[PDB]
Design a protein around this ligand. Structure first.
Ligand SMILES: COCCOCCn1nc(C)c2c1CSCc1cc(n(C)n1)CCc1cc(c3ccc(F)cc3c1)OCCCn1c(C(=O)O)c(C)c3c-2c(Cl)ccc31
Ligand SMILES: OC[C@H]1O[C@H](O[C@H]2[C@H](O)[C@@H](O)[C@@H](O)O[C@@H]2CO)[C@H](O)[C@@H](O)[C@@H]1O
Length: 518
């Protein structure tokens, strides 16, 4: 659990140009004598927050920007402070992708969007619409071919279709996200996912198709089309398939809307090599020669570095990438992105396999995506009204009947728990000696340990929240009212991270209201 001083360890996904990145590392070593180790572990975006929370992990982590707000919120990333001269070398919108709570939390590398990739020897002109794909598959099947194969195991690849007719993650209006307004189970999301499931039902696609299977089929000339990003072009070049890269098909006359990623490089907050990491990223990697080395291995997309992007922009494949990007949306970096992706991943897989209907699958995904914010609304309101004696007059907003009814229920059962268990609550409050915001921050680890052990039920959830209210009352009394919202956030995090799957299975807070009815 200690990052080694005087070297650099870098993590990057196994679909990216990690051999090219290692070449940049060798150049760094030639100048400095500092060895750079590039690794591409499986599930690195899940491994990183686990290991970094213990003060371990790589010095530098590469991922699309969407994961980084969660990492930064968890205190796992160093703030990035490049000088004006350096900042001005990258496009401003790329810096925007790596800004979280007003601070830069990573270096942007390149802009990624999915495109339609097609075999010109099979399909001289690609389909403009999703709706024509079934007929094209029929035509191709008579030749011993298929129309389309792409990864159905990762929702990144299916999202463009889900979003086309009106699906959305978190609503964006007036230059701001409404994190309360989730668009996973609306008519538009349903229409797109139904189209996908119908392709499967009608044997135009197979629910088991993954990245490797689709890549192999396209590169062997068995399927006429795939959906993939710039990183895939190297292996297609090697295959000698006569390919094009183009705009994704429309659905119901509307563009497919890919979620656009900015490949980014963050520095681990626990690294003792922050200056070496900055030097590597700014003066080795984010140069024309550094990016070229990575790009020659696996293409990056539209790079963040203006000078190199000027050269690459003439490539029609990059132009197509950017056309698809302009039709899509830059991913949020809010901490709830991880949960959104987990929820949608499960929905797509379950709908595609027939384990759930489209309606069932997307209802669950909606609940899972809404879970943190709805839970926080309820728990924050209860803790604060308990502490102050007065309720919050603000409207509940989205799913407001559920929030209101859950709060009403919690008032009843939670007040009962605080009364009946006053002795244990008072004893434990005194033992914990919670005085300030640092002490509140220290609670998460012990709360997880206690709460995650043993049986799962709504009663224990009430105890968790009710003791929170008991602590909040204390905090207010000792003029530490500012600690209550951080406490609420911490409790909510514990609840939703430890009980996610069970909570979704209960219909979330609707289950709670029903469980304690009368
Ligand atoms: C000093 O002994 C007093 C006598 O004790 C009798 C047994 N007895 N009876 C009851 C109802 C509880 C206990 C103590 S053993 C469990 C325990 C609690 C803690 N430790 C270290 N151990 C402290 C760490 C901690 C835990 C939290 C917090 C939640 C909010 C927060 F702001 C801070 C929190 C801080 O939640 C855990 C899940 C909910 N939970 C549960 C549960 O069922 O999960 C129980 C049983 C309790 C008890 C208490 Cl006093 C508080 C919460 C409980
Ligand atoms: O499928 C959900 C997944 O989507 C994105 O991951 C992409 C990544 O951005 C690409 O660079 C490439 O590696 O493919 C991944 C999909 O397998 C999100 O960035 C990620 O957080 C999310 O889990």
């Amino acid at each position: 659990g200690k990052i080694e001083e005087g070297k650099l360890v870098i993590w990057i996904n196994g679909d990216k140009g990690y051999n090219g990145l290692a070449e940049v590392g060798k150049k760094f070593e030639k100048d400095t004598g500092i060895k750079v180790t590039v690794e591409h572990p499986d599930k690195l975006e899940e491994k990183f927050p686990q290991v970094a929370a213990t003060g371990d992990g790589p010095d530098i982590i590469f991922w699309a920007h969407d994961r980084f707000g969660g990492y930064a919120q968890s205190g796992l990333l160093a703030e990035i402070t490049p000088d004006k001269a350096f900042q001005d070398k990258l496009y401003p919108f790329t810096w925007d992708a790596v800004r979280y709570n007003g601070k830069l939390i990573a270096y942007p590398i390149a802009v990624e969007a999915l495109s339609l990739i097609y075999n010109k020897d099979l399909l001289p002109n690609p389909p403009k619409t999703w709706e024509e794909i079934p007929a094209l598959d029929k035509e191709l099947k008579a030749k011993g071919k298929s129309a389309l194969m792409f990864n159905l195991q990762e929702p990144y690849f299916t999202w463009p279709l889900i979003a086309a007719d009106g699906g959305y993650a978190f609503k964006y209006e007036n230059g701001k996200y409404d994190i309360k307004d989730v668009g996973v189970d609306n008519a538009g999301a349903k229409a797109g996912l139904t189209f996908l499931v119908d392709l499967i039902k009608n044997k135009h696609m197979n629910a088991d198709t993954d990245y490797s299977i689709a890549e192999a089929a396209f590169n062997k000339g068995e399927t006429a089309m795939t959906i993939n990003g710039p990183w895939a072009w190297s292996n297609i070049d090697t295959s000698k398939v006569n390919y094009g890269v183009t705009v994704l098909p429309t659905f119901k006359g509307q563009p497919s809307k890919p979620f656009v990623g900015v490949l980014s490089a963050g520095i681990n907050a626990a690294s003792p090599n922050k200056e070496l990491a900055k030097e590597f990223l700014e003066n080795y990697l984010l140069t024309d020669e550094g990016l070229e080395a990575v790009n020659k291995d696996k293409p990056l997309g539209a790079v963040a570095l203006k000078s190199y992007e000027e050269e690459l922009a003439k490539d029609p494949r990059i132009a197509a990438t950017m056309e698809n990007a302009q039709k899509g949306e830059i991913m949020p970096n809010i901490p709830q992105m991880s949960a959104f992706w987990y929820a949608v991943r499960t929905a797509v897989i379950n709908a595609a396999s027939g384990r759930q209907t489209v309606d069932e699958a997307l209802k669950d995904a909606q609940t899972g995506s809404e879970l943190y914010r709805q839970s926080l609304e309820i728990i924050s309101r209860y803790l604060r009204e308990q502490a102050t004696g007065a309720a919050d007059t603000a409207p509940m907003g989205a799913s407001g009947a559920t929030s209101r009814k859950a709060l009403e229920t919690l008032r009843r059962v939670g007040d009962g728990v605080q009364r009946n268990h006053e002795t244990a609550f008072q004893g434990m409050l005194r033992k914990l000696d919670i005085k300030n915001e640092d002490d509140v921050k220290s609670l998460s680890r012990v709360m997880i340990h206690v709460f995650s052990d043993g049986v799962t039920n709504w009663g224990r959830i009430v105890t968790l929240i009710s003791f929170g209210a008991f602590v909040a009352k204390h905090l207010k009394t000792i003029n530490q009212e500012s600690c209550i919202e951080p406490l609420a956030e911490s409790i909510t995090d514990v609840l939703v991270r430890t009980k996610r799957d069970w909570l979704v299975k209960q219909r979330g807070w609707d289950g709670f209201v029903e469980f304690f009815h009368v």
